Amino acid sequence: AGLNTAAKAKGLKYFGSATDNPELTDSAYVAQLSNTDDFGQITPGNSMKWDATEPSQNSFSFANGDAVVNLANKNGQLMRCHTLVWHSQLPNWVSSGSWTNATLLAAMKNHITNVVTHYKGKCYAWDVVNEALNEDGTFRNSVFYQIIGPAYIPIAFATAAAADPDVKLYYNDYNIEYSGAKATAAQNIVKMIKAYGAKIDGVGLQAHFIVGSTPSQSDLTTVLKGYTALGVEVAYTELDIRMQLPSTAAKLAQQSTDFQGVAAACVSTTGCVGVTIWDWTDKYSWVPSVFQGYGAPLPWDENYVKKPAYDGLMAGLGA
Numbered sequence: 423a424g425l426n427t428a429a430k431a432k433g434l435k436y437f438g439s440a441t442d443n444p445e446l447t448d449s450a451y452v453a454q455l456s457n458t459d460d461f462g463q464i465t466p467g468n469s470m471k472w473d474a475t476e477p478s479q480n481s482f483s484f485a486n487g488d489a490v491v492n493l494a495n496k497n498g499q500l501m502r503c504h505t506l507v508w509h510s511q512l513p514n515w516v517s518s519g520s521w522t523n524a525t526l527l528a529a530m531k532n533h534i535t536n537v538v539t540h541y542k543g544k545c546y547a548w549d550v551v552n553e554a555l556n557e558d559g560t561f562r563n564s565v566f567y568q569i570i571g572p573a574y575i576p577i578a579f580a581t582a583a584a585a586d587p588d589v590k591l592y593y594n595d596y597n598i599e600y601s602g603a604k605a606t607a608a609q610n611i612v613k614m615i616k617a618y619g620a621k622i623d624g625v626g627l628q629a630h631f632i633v634g635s636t637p638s639q640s641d642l643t644t645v646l647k648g649y650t651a652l653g654v655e656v657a658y659t660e661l662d663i664r665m666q667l668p669s670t671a672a673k674l675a676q677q678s679t680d681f682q683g684v685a686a687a688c689v690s691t692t693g694c695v696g697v698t699i700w701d702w703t704d705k706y707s708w709v710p711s712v713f714q715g716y717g718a719p720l721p722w723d724e725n726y727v728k729k730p731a732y733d734g735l736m737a738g739l740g741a
């Protein structure tokens with residue numbers, strides 16, 4: 423009947439979509455987001471980030487995040503919660519602080535404890551740390567890495583695990599979906615967390631790909647298995663496949679085969695629990711404002727109509 427029913431038929435936990443609060447006032451959008459044939463899981467695109475949830479130190483703000491959880495709860499959808507420690511979308515107080523290891527650690531831990539406890543029981547997974555790596559596999563020079571060092575990553579995991587012992591704790595990153603230094607470094611982050619003694623349950627593969635330059639099914643699968651071999655689960659967390667504009671029939675067909683291979687890679691890897699697309703309609707994609715000249719990244723167009731990519735995903739799911 424749809425992407426999520428097809429996904430569950432193959433043993434995945436869900437097919438899902440990100441969303442954001444301004445889109446929840448569009449009744450046609452909400453109708454399809456709420457179609458559980460297609461979406462069994464929701465991620466908030468913005469309202470669980472640090473700037474949204476802790477705009478001032480120890481001053482938490484949950485209304486916008488809770489509005490997304492309320493929509494998922496209405497529909498019986500699972501939630502992925504996104505994201506606790508990330509260098510982007512930080513409030514001014516974090517980025518402008520004069521910190522010591524001890525003072526920034528205390529602020530970070532308090533952020534994690536508060537936000538994870540707030541959403542205790544409500545999340546399938548958290549993206550505990552996002553985007554910790556450079557492309558060469560070195561650590562990104564975020565405030566957290568500059569002040570705390572590598573230990574910030576396992577400390578974050580351990581803090582989240584104390585606050586909610588049942589939720590799956592993920593490390594989430596982009597360009598870790600294909601073989602290379604960054605993916606190896608992400609495997610090493612799993613290993614480092616466990617060597618510290620902290621819990622990590624999953625690796626989140628963003629999957630922000632480009633039409634005609636998408637990793638192949640074989641390389642996707644080799645990489646997924648490289649993480650599941652470590653005793654963690656995997657998911658594609660932010661899938662979109664942006665095209666160089668303008669859209670054409672040929673590019674739409676190529677985008678279908680690109681999405682097809684991602685779904686098929688996940689089915690072929692035991693331990694791949696699901697796929698989340700980063701929103702579901704081109705109308706609301708983040709892409710065009712960030713990647714100049716690119717767009718039309720999703721399985722529905724800006725008029726809420728299925729594109730050939732929808733059929734590619736169904737075909738990759740074996741439906």
Ligand SMILES: O[C@@H]1[C@@H](O)[C@H](O[C@@H]2CO[C@@H](O)[C@H](O)[C@H]2O)OC[C@H]1O
Pocket residue numbers: 442467468552596628660708
């Ligand atoms: O609305 C936008 C969001 O869709 C966007 O989300 C980020 C996209 O890049 C991924 O790497 C991040 O993990 C994800 O949160 O953030 C910017 C915002 O304007």
Ligand SMILES: O[C@@H]1[C@@H](O)[C@H](O[C@@H]2CO[C@H](O)[C@H](O)[C@H]2O)OC[C@H]1O
Pocket residue numbers: 510553596597630631632
């Ligand atoms: O906020 C960041 C973006 O800067 C980032 O961009 C990558 C760069 O390498 C690629 O071409 C990949 O397709 C892009 O998505 O993307 C993720 C986002 O976190």
Ligand SMILES: *[C@@H]1O[C@H](CO)[C@@H](O)[C@H](O)[C@H]1NC(C)=O
Pocket residue numbers: 523524527569570571573
């Ligand atoms: C910060 O302190 C923790 C001990 O609380 C430690 O694990 C970490 O390595 C320290 N980092 C730096 C740069 O001192």
